Assembly symmetry: D2
């Protein structure tokens, strides 16, 4: 699946729709980023710039100018073509090819932005700019506005009003189109296939990073070159560290391993977590904690639908958790009192759900305590977990267990669609999958 | 192989040896680096900071203080331990464990650096600081020195002399110790194994990125998690782009593929290039260019030794290249005149060799045109290539061919040791390897 | 005359009137300014901050918060009282005395601005801020907004809209109230008295700076301590330099001297220019140029009224100038053609009029080429001049003559009031004044 | 008196003498400084830049290059000539006239500094730069050094060593030459004449600022246009504020007035303080405090000579003060104990002496607690004072009295020369001077 030329066009028009007349919106590309000395990390475009362009070069700026309700036009600033730079670092779109390729009206050289941008903003009333996003952008925009401010005698005038477009644009990104959902559907499949493979490859004596290697390879073979975030493979006590990325330990027979990994496919993030026994067989103590987390997830998948909220579903999860922990004697006392005391917090110390899209932790307003009413087209994670510290004052058998199970969903008209259920999570199905792989 | 505690200690003492008495050297850690929104790229420590510490955290500063020729001491600033931050983002060394772990005399909290650093520099004559390396470092150091300058009444005095330690430190990094050579030897093996695997896996119809996937997996399985630079898989005309990293094309029967890839193992870079036929059989035209590049490499490996230079060996390569190209009718005229006219430059437009170590393009002074006399312990690449543009005015059969073959060497007392010859480069050996793999 | 507490209150309410509901306006004080080493220039408050406060301290910020059309409140940030700082550098208002003294609802310590400002902006829709005015202000405001932006989880929200208040505020300053006009009336008298004194004191052999000394003393004795701009005393060829401030030359019998000087009285600027003979008697050649400039001024004073513009009156001045210069043979040709060719520009190269108020070159929109229709309460200068270069190709007798004559006016319902006519400008009156003084 | 061309040359050579071979020193001009909107304060050159040039323009940089012990040369960057800018803002030296005028070898356009400076620093070992002095300077210098650092391939190398020249240069400024002493001698006379005039003009009912007006006029008439610091006229309780500059109060019969004022003559500062009765007759209570301060000054003038220190003379002053205050019953107890308890500090809370020169608070190392041994050619103030707070718990008659008496001296081979004794300080002489003036 992919995002069409027409879709990028629709998004741009949807933004312009909301802009005031006599205004321009400025959306800047991500800078290149040093890894060490003269080597740079693989380039990752700004998510918002990408959203409106699908253009993967640095030193580029989209300018959308609204004259009035029926008249608007677009200017791109981008890198000029350069034979020497392209012999070294590969091909550039240039100015001639850009209008047709990216559906913009005009394309100018980024090297001329300071000579041209103030002319585009001259006489406008409003400029939409994400102030503080990038320092190079702020310098360019402030420089433009100062020229206009100080150019009274040359009949120049600056727009007096600057508006942050991030609220508006992030509100757009919160609701996925059918194309975006199709792309996320494929990202979920690719990520699921990686997680299945890691379960099938896991043996005692392999290192945590070996499963990372397996996951990244499977991403790559379906055309998702990069992960959406740094892969987490926490075996044993490392499963209690939420964003454990060291992945440096030998995986031991008897321990669980928690894998939190997601591919980036056409810009969009998958995000799955599966926890499983390194030796293919859950112990009683491991099953006792796993079942509480699995019930939390399964109940959440039942409940998520238009008209509820992350907060409301989280309340049901907390009840399931506190009840389970009381039965194991990890918590002591009255369930409802323990709930009112937030007694689950030593063991479940993060949110159940975050928005998902072009960013793994996606943009969009949550409301207070994530109370926002859910609507169709919202995409989110469902990731309950229980993490019992090595030193927790609880029965010995539960200490140092970290379990998280995560699926990705889209809210539909009548409920949700699960994008990641192609990798197993019922414990008997996990064990059957690993047994089958160990034969072969 | 690894770098010992004692070695990090020796390096620190070797730097202190060269410092003036009444001085302090400040070596700052790399900042964390955003990939997108709240996600960061995998952390990569500053190479120079790493060189003296083997410490892989951000927000850390090594301070080496030389009182005189027999008296010196060390202070580390580093992140304080924090239960909440460590539940999320993993374990921190802290201040208590640091002296023993990293062999420093004292460790203080990075959050107190502005309250403590000026006290350490007070009354010194010289400060060694890599000015402009990092903006956060410059702010901290300038802030410290201004306090001292303005604190006459509190009996404070700033050192009046600031010296850049990068020249001195990079001169140290230029000469590898036996431990470093052993680590680079293993990086060369790991990288070689990845390149062999890519040759064995290559089939027509696979994408360029699939070989990248194979290479990265093989790095990972020997404990080199990350590449030392962004992997280059340029098939067909993409082989003419020197740092081609898009790797987005279907590999076609009839084309060559150029793979430039290197692992990062215990901080140190491998860097191998192999070019081979996608279908396992070189054409006549491909052999004709490949043989010139291979002869260049093989002759360079013969020649590199103490007492010569990259410049001197490059002159021999140019002769081999110009002679070969004249025989194919790619160049026309007298060889010696064509050499004097640099007529090879349209086809070979980069250097033959760069320093290799903690950085793939390593630190250390080259001399004018890389004329520096080579000595034992220098580590470098040998990477001749020929790149005939799709539109070059040459016989049709040579157009769009890009070939590079690269080995990594260490200069020894009597010559060089090749670190990367465990992956084949003779064409008959390449073809035999691929045939064998295709059976299965 | 002075500006009342009630007037500062009216101005604040007039600004609030124009603000959107759910907004705050931030007006910052001028920083202190180094003259050399640890000595600072006499403090000059930001004109706009002063306009709303009459408060003459640095490190202060007025915050006007509009909740809705009937509800608004004010917060001042200002320096805390400090016994040690006040023993040295004099008394501070502090927080306790500020509400009553300056008519604000609340006063907080400037040292707490970063802990308090984001709380005041939290949940607002709009912030009025003069971006780029002062770097220390921008740092404080950007810092506040970033806290709010990043504080979603703490239920913080930044205003998405930032508006420049300078256009609105400068439009207010363009129209003087009766109090402001009374203050400017007194500034005009004080400045006039200084100019009369300089004419009366001038003798051949005195230096240009001696008249500067006389002028500054007379300002001071009427309670205007500082000039509104650096005093210009250009005798001879120095009169051809428009902002000549060196004032370093001996004044010679035979030369004219041009004095451009203005006091600053209760914040408001006087601005008078008088040119006169150093020896008390105009030569024929000097009278010939002086009369053209005087006619220009006198005609302009006749013409300025509601419904005309600086541009329209300038056209009449140009005609007078070109006609006069043609009669002297300084210009050759047809008057109307010479006008169309802007042939006056080598001799009159500045504007006839600028706005006057808290700044000598006051704020307020001029329109294209100063075409804005004049209305009652606008205050402006009328300053025609002719400057014939030492090397101009004109009859010898006119070379090196610089003459400017300037009055300050307020536009009234039926014309203008001249604020500066108490110092003479008719040449016979100048000569009589100097003769009388020489007896002284 | 003035500073010769030859003297500026000697100073430059004296600096070069101390520089390392293969080095360059960079001395930047002061920036222009805004007073309000488009008006700037009178320009004041950087004292150190002035010291080596006597050049009073902004946007200028002196570069002194030492090749070795017998070879050095100078480059000036300065503003290019511009007819339009000079019609407005006066004449510029330019590049052609600068070598001869300022005795430099070469002069280049400041607008080309970024294209030229790195070429001057290329291949040098050391750069002397006053880091942090001016932000525009740091930008230029860092920019130059980064070009050199990054220009290995263009055979560029940066100096690795940066040294602050301020310590060296300020040590030079600490010792005045005969020319400088002659100029300071005249500054002392001019300042003395101003102080005499203020005493002669003072009447009850005049404002504090009126005496400021008298002082500034007298500075001006001897060719010292500007004061060296903001004039202090503290009558009554305002005399207890050390740097009182408001000067806003009516001077009342019965009160003392403290005048601290100094001219700036050819760059050099005078600094005199005289305290006297507003009505021309000291009361008993006023005489009782005045006599302690006068004895302190007179004893200090006796004592100051080579081989003592500000600290050592201050100890004698403290004894005189504590003894006097005990006799008046302002202090109670044993003199030697009260001295050991620093019991004088509520009444004398500043230093007795500061260095004087191009800055009123001049450069040069004081030593701990101003213990530095004095040598011939050091120039300093002698300014004992007693300030009894309005609310001090002391006999009523002493409350709200602030008295300071200050002379300026140069240390000679056998003692000191008083530069400011031409204005009276014995009380009977003050009273006779005012009586005589009142007749006016
Ligand atoms: Mg256990
Ligand atoms: Mg071909
Ligand atoms: Mg003449
Ligand atoms: Mg009294």
């Amino acid at each position: 699946s992919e995002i069409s030329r027409q879709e990028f066009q629709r998004r741009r028009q949807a933004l312009v729709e909301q802009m005031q007349p006599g205004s321009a919106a400025l959306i800047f590309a991500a800078p290149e980023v040093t890894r060490s000395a003269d080597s740079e990390y693989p380039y990752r475009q700004n998510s918002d710039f990408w959203y409106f362009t699908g253009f993967n070069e640095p030193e580029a700026v989209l300018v959308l100018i609204k004259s009035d309700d029926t008249h608007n036009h677009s200017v791109l600033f981008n890198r000029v073509r350069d034979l020497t730079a392209e012999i070294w670092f590969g091909r550039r779109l240039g100015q001639d090819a850009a209008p047709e390729k990216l559906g913009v009206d005009r394309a100018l050289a980024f090297s001329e932005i300071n000579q041209q941008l103030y002319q585009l903003l001259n006489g406008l009333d409003v400029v939409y700019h994400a102030q503080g996003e990038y320092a190079y952008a702020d310098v360019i925009v402030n420089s433009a506005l100062e020229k206009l401010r100080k150019g009274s005698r040359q009949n120049l005038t600056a727009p007096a009003t600057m508006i942050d477009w991030r609220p508006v644009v992030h509100e757009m990104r919160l609701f996925k189109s059918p194309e975006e959902i199709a792309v996320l559907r494929r990202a979920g499949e690719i990520t699921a296939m990686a997680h299945t493979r890691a379960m099938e490859k896991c043996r005692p004596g392999m290192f945590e990073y070996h499963l990372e290697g397996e996951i990244h390879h499977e991403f790559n073979r379906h055309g998702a070159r990069y992960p959406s975030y740094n892969t987490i493979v926490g075996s044993g006590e490392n499963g209690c560290i939420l964003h454990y990325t060291e992945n440096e330990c030998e995986m031991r027979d008897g321990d669980l391993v928690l894998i939190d990994a997601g591919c980036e496919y056409k810009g969009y993030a998958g995000d799955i977590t599966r926890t499983f026994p390194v030796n293919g067989k859950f112990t009683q103590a491991q099953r006792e904690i796993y079942d509480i987390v699995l019930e939390s997830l399964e109940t959440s998948l039942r409940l998520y639908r238009p008209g509820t909220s992350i907060l409301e579903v989280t309340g049901e999860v907390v009840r399931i958790m506190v009840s389970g922990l009381v039965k194991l004697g990890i918590l002591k006392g009255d369930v409802d009192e323990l709930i009112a005391q937030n007694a689950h917090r030593p063991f479940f110390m993060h949110g159940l759900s975050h928005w998902l899209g072009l960013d793994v932790h996606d943009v969009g307003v949550y409301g207070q305590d994530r109370s926002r009413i859910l609507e169709p087209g919202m995409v989110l994670t469902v990731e309950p977990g229980l993490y019992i510290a090595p030193d927790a004052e609880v029965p010995e058998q539960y200490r140092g267990i970290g379990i998280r199970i995560e699926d990705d969903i889209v809210i539909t008209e009548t409920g949700n669609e699960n994008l990641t259920a192609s990798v197993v999570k019922k414990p008997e199905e996990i064990e059957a999958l690993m047994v089958a792989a160990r034969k072969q």
